[PDB]
Amino acid sequence: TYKFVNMREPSMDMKSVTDRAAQTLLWTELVRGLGMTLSYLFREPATINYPFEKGPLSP
Amino acid sequence: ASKVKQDMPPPGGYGPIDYKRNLPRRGLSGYSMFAVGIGTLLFGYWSMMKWNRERRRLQIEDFEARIALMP
Numbered sequence: 001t002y003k004f005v006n007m008r009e010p011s012m013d014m015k016s017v018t019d020r021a022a023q024t025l026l027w028t029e030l031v032r033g034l035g036m037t038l039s040y041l042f043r044e045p046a047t048i049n050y051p052f053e054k055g056p057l058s059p
Numbered sequence: 060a061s062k063v064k065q066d067m068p069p070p071g072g073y074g075p076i077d078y079k080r081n082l083p084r085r086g087l088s089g090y091s092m093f094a095v096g097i098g099t100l101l102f103g104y105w106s107m108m109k110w111n112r113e114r115r116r117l118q119i120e121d122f123e124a125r126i127a128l129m130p
């Protein structure tokens with residue numbers, strides 16, 4: 001089976017048109033990406049303290 | 060009395076693994092966003108109107124003091 005990755009058409013009701021116009025004029029998805037990067041900023045880093053800490057190894 | 064031991068999944072298998080996209084909506088409406096913008100614009104305009112009228116009166120007072128001193 002298969003699926004289409006980009007085959008949807010936007011709804012043309014006045015509410016949807018206004019929402020898209022607000023997204024265009026007020027940079028909503030850009031602020032969303034900013035929020036994602038800020039979330040990563042407040043997460044904990046994954047860096048080990050080499051050479052005092054070593055990565056995992058196996059036999 | 061030793062049995063074959065091997066890397067196998069647990070009885071009943073593993074739990075479901077999520078793979079679908081999960082981008083939510085997480086937003087207000089365009090109408091509400093525009094309303095907030097217009098409201099803050101109007102509040103700012105009103106405040107600047109009052110403050111700038113006060114500044115004009117202050118300038119008139121300073122100019123009058125200068126006129127009094129000019130002779």
Ligand SMILES: CCCCCCCC/C=C\CCCCCCCC(=O)O[C@H](COC(=O)CCCCCCC/C=C/CCCCCCCC)COP(=O)(O)OCCN
Nearest residue numbers: 023024025026027029030031034093096097098100101104
């Ligand atoms: C009472 C009557 C009042 C009358 C005034 C009414 C005005 C209020 C409503 C209108 C305001 C509209 C906002 C004006 C800015 C819009 C800019 C714009 O044109 O939007 C984007 C253009 O802007 C961008 O694309 C931005 C790209 C760069 C983004 C990278 C940084 C932005 C993220 C940081 C957020 C910035 C926050 C600003 C803080 C300022 C602090 C001083 C559209 O471009 P396209 O989507 O490509 O399509 C156009 C052709 N089809």
